[PDB]
C-alpha cells in the first residue's frame, strides 16, 4: 500500500525508463490507470506495476 501527497493506491514499486520534467507528480499510460510516480524525496522516477 502507498499514500502519496494527495493520490494513493496499492501495488509494487520498481524502476522506470520514462522521464519527467520539473512539474510532474503523477503518471498513467491510458484511461486513468495510474502507474508512474517520481518520488517527492529522492526526486527519482518509478513505475507502478
Amino acid at each position: 500500500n502507498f499514500n502519496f501527497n494527495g493520490l494513493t493506491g496499492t501495488g509494487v514499486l520498481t524502476e522506470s525508463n520514462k522521464k519527467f520534467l520539473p512539474f510532474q507528480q503523477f503518471g498513467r499510460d491510458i484511461a486513468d490507470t495510474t502507474d508512474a510516480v517520481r518520488d517527492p524525496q529522492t526526486l527519482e522516477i518509478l513505475d507502478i506495476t
Binding site: 491510458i30 486513468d32 490507470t33
Partner: protein, 49 residues
C-alpha cells in the same frame, strides 16, 4: 501473384478482421473509463469516500 500483390500493398481489404478487434477494443476502453464517472457521487474514485 496478384493475391500476393493485393494483400501486401493494400490494407483496406483486411478491414473485416480489423473491425472485429476494433469492435472488441472500443468496448474495453469504454468499460474502464466509466470509473471516472460519479453517478451522482461526491467522487468517482472509491478510496476517497
Amino acid at each position: 501473384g496478384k493475391i500476393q500483390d493485393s494483400l501486401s500493398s493494400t490494407a483496406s481489404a483486411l478491414g473485416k478482421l480489423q473491425d472485429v478487434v476494433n469492435q472488441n477494443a472500443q468496448a474495453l476502453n469504454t468499460l474502464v473509463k466509466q470509473l471516472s464517472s460519479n453517478f451522482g457521487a461526491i467522487s468517482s474514485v472509491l478510496n476517497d469516500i
